Structure 1
């Protein structure tokens, strides 16, 4: 495979960018639409849906379970029943949301369903969710990929305790299907360190939009009452995490990037994102239903806690590497990134140091000292966000090439074209 040369920005970037839909919101809407249709509530359409490998894996997963998902662009319509064929096998790819959100849903069928995924996915955490399903009465063969969920057409539900420190998706996956368990579900996270609170809150918010009653009033505990899931139209927001890769271009070049269709109130962690950008003294403004970021003339090192928004780490690490020479930045709260698409703490360390940088993995993150970088081959590890981090670096370092820019298809297949149009 040919590398992809990351274009440089010898002058400030100036651009209006539209990023496609939120992967997290699209895949939740697909699951909730599937549940409504399976309950006999009718078809649902999701408008502005992201079309990417992770959402194609989710809609193919629902079709493996027997549902129908129509739509060739961003408007997807879900209908039908959960009625898997003999030998049903869900391909999870490297999509955590398919791996974690579809085994519960699948426990609703009366035909077992096998789950498999990419070689690289087999290294990602999953066993605590499979133990939770067994505790809820589900027969599950296997403790890792490939595993089989032997549903009985019913799932009893009840109360379960789970260690979800490795992934908030274990909580979201249980919550999304819980209203269809006979008795609902009370889920308790045991211990501490629960990452990605905004993504569990995203789940709760979308459940309430579907008419599901969920009590999240006590931290680390969720109670979902059994009840119908409405068949409604879903309107998907732009992916704000991917927007940050583009906004980073403004930040490191002293330029100006606007993102269209930015929601003033979002189901995503918009407020965390805008606060981090403001930490680097970017000016951030809302205007014309768009978000405009103007980068500073320079920025020093920063400390940032990414526990709630760990998927920002690759872009934020690239920002830290490009701070004024000698600056030190500490990224913390992100031990769980060892279990992501790749071990992102190790990979970011490896690729920054390859370019001559100074990045030290810590027990919960990275310490990065901004030092002059040089050309190299930035490896993506089949991880869309490693690939985009290489693009951010290459804005300010000539001769940086990403090995596999097609890794961006996980959540942003048009990234090369969008990035090229932005840098111009």
Structure 2
């Protein structure tokens, strides 16, 4: 509901999976919808952007059954040519990824589609995909190179070899999809190799791929898929179990990034008790994460990790609040407004929960202490709202978190997952 109310936890326990992120979730259902056969998708993020993708595919005749509370989809593929013109404009909500992937998928279809979304989405730039898509023969009308986009399906799409002056996995993913419906082969080359989840998903669905090249005329084969859990969503539970006495949990199949330091490792530096096991590379790289309660010490976050901490794992600041000593985030230069606002909200909430915290022009400083019960404002930022729900696990009293509407729309299963592991949170009427 509008506000979240928590009460202190007796200690977390149990095993859960957290959903994957938006990007992999979109790609999985999209590829499954045009495959032949039935695909069961586990770990599908059930937020508004991902369900907007689902409803769009259904408008075009896809068979997708949604089990929201279990993060499951069961897709009966309609084949490469089973999509049909939607009767109305496809509303992509706030999803830039949805509109861009759908533009690639629909450019080579033998029908027309209008793609739009909310006012935020109607300002998102689209030239980067429109031009390359036009080279393959796409007919995409738009004003100001932003949505709405009217795609006049071109069944005569032809493959292209594309040489980019800068890396971009968003363009690549779009062209790979358009390539599935284009004559000959479509190839994408970059100065440096960019992120490649689309490529692995294509292989998972048994499409042939040969820089990165794909050919039209091939066929997608249904194949069950378990989306790796988003480390950002998992971080909430990792911190919860780390700071709450008597806690022991296991997070199954969480996507792990081996090339970066990360939240698990920053937590380990604070003295956390985390075991990463059962590492596999057949999904993105995946692992089970076992977390037990552990006393923590404040650390100096290296500059390179400051933006990432604030952007992706602000719940790490909740762990700093209960550690012994101070934790310091100082970036080389003053932070961007998005970062500055985020830290100001975290600092203000922490202060309201009796923690000594100061915002800096290039970061923040947290004096480790004791979280008290009280009231904070999430400022409709789901990451902030969730971080304070986690602070509630150890707070001396109940914590009320105002304006949590965006948690339901970004990560709706948070509340049920929190409760299932012993972390008390319930939606209540606000203001």
- TM (normalized to structure 2)? 0.74
Asked whether the equivalents of residues 116 and 148 of structure 2 are also in contact (C-alpha less than 8 Å), the reply is yes
Asked whether the equivalents of residues 133 and 178 of structure 2 are also in contact (C-alpha less than 8 Å), the reply is no
CA distance, structure 1, for counterparts of residue 292 and residue 148 of structure 2: 47
What is the DSSP-based 3-state SS (H/G/I as helix, E as strand, rest coil) of the residue aligned with 1:262? strand
What is the DSSP-based 3-state SS (H/G/I as helix, E as strand, rest coil) of the residue aligned with 1:278? helix
Q: CA deviation at 1:399?
A: 6.3
* Aligned CA-pair RMSD: 3.8
Question: 1:83-138: CA deviations, max 9, x gaps?
Answer: 1135x422222334313322111212233322222334445554423343334432
Asked whether the equivalents of residues 92 and 115 of structure 1 are also in contact (C-alpha less than 8 Å), the reply is yes
Asked whether the equivalents of residues 305 and 332 of structure 1 are also in contact (C-alpha less than 8 Å), the reply is no
What is the DSSP-based 3-state SS (H/G/I as helix, E as strand, rest coil) of the residue aligned with 2:114? strand
What is the DSSP-based 3-state SS (H/G/I as helix, E as strand, rest coil) of the residue aligned with 2:313? helix
Asked whether the equivalents of residues 354 and 376 of structure 1 are also in contact (C-alpha less than 8 Å), the reply is no
Asked whether the equivalents of residues 272 and 296 of structure 2 are also in contact (C-alpha less than 8 Å), the reply is no
Asked whether the equivalents of residues 159 and 185 of structure 1 are also in contact (C-alpha less than 8 Å), the reply is yes
CA distance, structure 1, for counterparts of residue 90 and residue 379 of structure 2: 25
Q: CA deviation at 1:370?
A: 0.9
Cα separation, partners in 2 of 1:323 and 1:131, compared to 1, 3 Å: farther
Question: 1:223-251: CA deviations, max 9, x gaps?
Answer: 33445243222221452322221111123
Question: Which of 350, 366, 371 is equivalent to 1:370?
Answer: 366
**Corresponding residue for residue 205 of structure 2:** 210
**Corresponding residue for residue 185 of structure 2:** 184
CA distance, structure 2, for counterparts of residue 116 and residue 399 of structure 1: 42
- TM (normalized to structure 1)? 0.76
CA distance, structure 1, for counterparts of residue 161 and residue 41 of structure 2: 35
Question: 1:185-211: CA deviations, max 9, x gaps?
Answer: 323456x8x9xx5xx332222222223
Q: CA deviation at 1:158?
A: 0.7
Asked whether the equivalents of residues 38 and 223 of structure 2 are also in contact (C-alpha less than 8 Å), the reply is yes
Asked whether the equivalents of residues 109 and 154 of structure 1 are also in contact (C-alpha less than 8 Å), the reply is no
What is the DSSP-based 3-state SS (H/G/I as helix, E as strand, rest coil) of the residue aligned with 2:295? coil
What is the DSSP-based 3-state SS (H/G/I as helix, E as strand, rest coil) of the residue aligned with 2:297? coil
Asked whether the equivalents of residues 246 and 257 of structure 1 are also in contact (C-alpha less than 8 Å), the reply is no
1:61 aligns with 2:51: no
Asked whether the equivalents of residues 26 and 50 of structure 1 are also in contact (C-alpha less than 8 Å), the reply is yes
**Corresponding residue for residue 247 of structure 2:** 256
* 1:87-236 pair list within 5 angstroms: 88-122=88-122, 124=124, 126-140=126-140, 141-142=142-143, 143-161=145-163, 168-189=169-190, 200-214=195-209, 221-226=211-216, 228-236=218-226
Question: Which of 221, 244, 257 is equivalent to 1:269?
Answer: 257
How many corresponding residue pairs?
389
Q: CA deviation at 1:175?
A: 3.1
**Corresponding residue for residue 409 of structure 1:** 408
What is the DSSP-based 3-state SS (H/G/I as helix, E as strand, rest coil) of the residue aligned with 1:144? coil
**Corresponding residue for residue 391 of structure 1:** 389
Asked whether the equivalents of residues 157 and 182 of structure 1 are also in contact (C-alpha less than 8 Å), the reply is yes
Question: 1:37-78: CA deviations, max 9, x gaps?
Answer: xxxxx2331242526133321211112333232354624113
CA distance, structure 2, for counterparts of residue 321 and residue 385 of structure 1: 16
What is the DSSP-based 3-state SS (H/G/I as helix, E as strand, rest coil) of the residue aligned with 2:130? helix
CA distance, structure 1, for counterparts of residue 277 and residue 114 of structure 2: 48
CA distance, structure 1, for counterparts of residue 171 and residue 409 of structure 2: 20
Asked whether the equivalents of residues 12 and 247 of structure 2 are also in contact (C-alpha less than 8 Å), the reply is yes
CA distance, structure 1, for counterparts of residue 393 and residue 213 of structure 2: 47
Question: Which of 239, 244, 249 is equivalent to 2:235?
Answer: 244
Cα separation, partners in 2 of 1:368 and 1:133, compared to 1, 3 Å: farther
